[PDB]
Amino acid sequence: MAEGFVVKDIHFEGLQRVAVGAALLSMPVRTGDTVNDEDISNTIRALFATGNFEDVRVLRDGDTLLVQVKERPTIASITFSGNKSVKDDMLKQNLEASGVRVGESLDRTTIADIEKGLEDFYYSVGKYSASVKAVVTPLPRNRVDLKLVFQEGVSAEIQQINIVGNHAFTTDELISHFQLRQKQKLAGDLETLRSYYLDRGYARFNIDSTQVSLTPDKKGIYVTVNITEGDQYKLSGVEVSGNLAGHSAEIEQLTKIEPGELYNGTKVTKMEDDIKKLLGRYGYAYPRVQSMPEINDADKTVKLRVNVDAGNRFYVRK
Ligand SMILES: [Mg+2]
């Protein structure tokens, strides 16, 4: 039951990029409230959850609730050095989708993760021995320069690949398509494998896991891909909704199909691209188009749900 004190006011220490107003709105307490250790735990927990801080302290000072913080440094610049097989822009992109980019905060605890995530990104191009080293340099105004040093290592060529879980198609049939029109890279093989099934009605197809064993000289790899085929599915309908910018009728006309035709992953992509192209011809250069299947295992059918948001109509007068 305890009691706790009544907050007469709140003092902050450490705020820099975080507005005091935004710091207060993110806190579960304000002046006038009676705060106890439980509330202080909530406040500390809440401030940390913003992701803005590297450390939060909250303690009573007479009638004042004192909030002391250590904001994450701001990433002023990211430099990739030593890479060549994979270019700067691609590495920049890979980090951006991973919560890391110039102008944002660097969570100093996640560093090892950034290094490992990049070394792994390298698996996408046949290099399983890459090593990445993050060099963080402290700047003024709590800023930081992030430099990543790469030793890409040797590329590995597929020595052998096995498929486990394929009954509908023979392993040789499937592998026969990994030889383009060593040959193709693993990443390409998986992409080809998936499409093979998705283009033939296997709406449930899934690559469950991929085991890759690197040879002692690290120049070859042995692959085992474990898949779940599932059954073939009939497409029973295509539903499109969202913000169609007054073109539902034309887009609706692009969802035309043969009721009950086989599900086909590629036709779906084509449909979407066709919708994008249609909206482009009206001033919309960046429309959001996503598709989610509604699978009915009962009678092996699929309803395709397409969401569309036309976006910003960009007018440019010369
Ligand atoms: Mg470079």
Cα of 58 from ligand 1 centre, angstroms? 43
The hierarchical CATH code for the domain 156-232 is 3.10.20.310
Give the three-class secondary structure for 212.
strand
Its sign, for the CA torsion 163, 166, 172, 174, is negative
Cα of 82 from ligand 1 centre, angstroms? 6
The hierarchical CATH code for the domain 73-155 is 3.10.20.310
Locate tokens 């449930």: which residue? 204
Kindly report the three-state secondary structure assignment for every residue of 162-185: EEECCCCCCHHHHHCCCCCCCCCC
Cα of 8 from ligand 1 centre, angstroms? 54
Cα of 71 from ligand 1 centre, angstroms? 29
Is residue 274 a contact partner of residue 254, using CB atoms and an 8 Å limit?
A: yes
Locate tokens 């009573």: which residue? 60
Please list, residue by residue across 22-54, b when 16 or more beta carbons sit within 10 angstroms of its beta carbon and e when fewer do: ebeeebebeeeeebeeebbebbbeebeeeebbb
Residue 60 belongs to what H/E stretch?
strand 53-61
What does the chain come to in residues?
318
- Please state how this structure was obtained: X-ray
Is residue 76 a contact partner of residue 143, using CB atoms and an 8 Å limit?
A: yes
CB count, 10 Å around CB of 77?
A: 13
To one decimal, the resolution in angstroms is: 2.2
Cα of 81 from ligand 1 centre, angstroms? 4
Its sign, for the CA torsion 149, 154, 158, 162, is negative
Domain map of the chain by residue range? 1-72, 73-155, 156-232, 233-318
Cα of 88 from ligand 1 centre, angstroms? 5
Closest among 71, 88, 92, 81 to 143, alpha carbons compared: 71
Locate tokens 């599915």: which residue? 233
Q: Which amino acid is at 180?
A: L
233-318 shares the fold of 73-155: yes
Is residue 245 a contact partner of residue 278, using CB atoms and an 8 Å limit?
A: no
Cα of 135 from ligand 1 centre, angstroms? 14
Categorise residue 142: left if φ over 0, alpha if ψ from -120 to 50, beta otherwise.
left
Burial of 106 (0-12, 13-18, 19+ CB in 10 A): buried
Cα of 99 from ligand 1 centre, angstroms? 20
Biggest CA–CA distance in the chain, Å, is 77
Cα of 79 from ligand 1 centre, angstroms? 7
Closest among 67, 57, 74 to 17, alpha carbons compared: 74
The topology (CATH level 3) of 233-318 is: Ubiquitin-like (UB roll) (3.10.20)
Cα of 316 from ligand 1 centre, angstroms? 35
Cα of 133 from ligand 1 centre, angstroms? 13
Cα of 212 from ligand 1 centre, angstroms? 28
Cα of 214 from ligand 1 centre, angstroms? 26
Radius of gyration of the chain (CA): 27
Cα of 147 from ligand 1 centre, angstroms? 10
Cα–Cα distance for residue pair 177/196, rounded to 1 Å: 9
Cα of 28 from ligand 1 centre, angstroms? 45
Q: Which residues surround ligand 1, an ion (CB under 5 A)?
A: 80, 83, 88
Cα of 138 from ligand 1 centre, angstroms? 21
In CATH terms, the superfamily for domain 1-72 is membrane protein fhac (3.10.20.310)
CA angle at 310 for the pair 307 and 312, rounded to the nearest 5°: 145
Cα of 150 from ligand 1 centre, angstroms? 9
Cα of 156 from ligand 1 centre, angstroms? 22
Cα of 152 from ligand 1 centre, angstroms? 11
Cα of 53 from ligand 1 centre, angstroms? 30
Give the three-class secondary structure for 42.
helix
Cα of 182 from ligand 1 centre, angstroms? 28
Residue 255 gets which letter from DSSP? T
Task: Give long-range contacts, CB 8 A cutoff, 24+ apart: 236-241.
Answer: 236/260, 236/296, 236/301, 236/302, 236/303, 237/303, 237/304, 238/271, 238/303, 238/304, 238/306, 239/303, 239/304, 239/305, 239/306, 240/275, 240/306, 240/307, 240/308, 241/306, 241/307, 241/308
